[PDB]
């Protein structure tokens, strides 16, 4: 086939009922996810193929970075709930990775109050119950289906995407190859 199983993409042992349509993991400590998220766009390459009616998810993990991979677990949470994940992403990739200007939990909210969220606001987020199920789901989402590498995506939490088994000579048709199966992945 042209689509093969161990190939462009991997089929869990253990499906996961219940999972989120498209399920992407990420950290801002991971070097590839710096790459899809500022160089390949994978995320909304992926949305721009997507269906209608398809909900797309990503999440932060824990287990890059130590103390400061968890304090990014909970900012993720708390851009979630406040919807401005893409006010912080770029800014919070660089912080960590390009400028290394990322140390410390006050740090992250330096972040969030340069992108315009205000102190007060940020605060009570990051202190809410709601961002604590937030958190919680991330983690939970992860757990199932046994997470030790990202950037990771899953599909219907069934499939696997393996980036592993495309080209990377163009970096342009790789991503459409990611996302071309991704949407054979939703088609299935």
């Not at 399920?23 to 766009?41: A, R, W």
């Not at 604590?132 to 499939?159: C, H, I, T, W």
Request: contains cysteine; aromatic residues 12%; glycine residues 6%.
């Amino acid at each position: 086939a042209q689509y093969e199983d161990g190939k462009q993409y991997t089929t869990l042992e253990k499906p996961v009922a219940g999972a989120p349509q498209v399920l992407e993991f990420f950290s801002f400590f991971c070097p590839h996810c710096y790459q899809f998220e500022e160089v390949l766009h994978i995320s909304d390459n992926v949305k721009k193929k997507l269906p209608e009616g398809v909900k797309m998810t990503k999440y932060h993990v824990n287990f890059m970075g130590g103390d400061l991979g968890k304090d990014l677990t909970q900012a993720w949470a708390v851009a979630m709930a406040l919807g401005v994940e893409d006010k912080v992403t770029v800014p919070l990739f660089e912080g960590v990775q390009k400028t290394q200007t990322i140390r410390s939990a006050s740090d992250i909210r330096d972040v969030f109050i340069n992108a315009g969220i205000k102190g007060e606001e940020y605060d009570a987020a990051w202190n809410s119950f709601v961002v604590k199920s937030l958190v919680a789901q991330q983690e939970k989402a992860a757990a199932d289906v046994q997470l030790r590498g990202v950037p990771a995506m899953f599909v219907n939490g069934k499939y696997q995407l393996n980036p592993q088994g495309m080209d990377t000579s163009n970096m342009d048709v790789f991503v459409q190859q990611y996302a071309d199966t991704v949407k054979y992945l939703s088609e299935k």
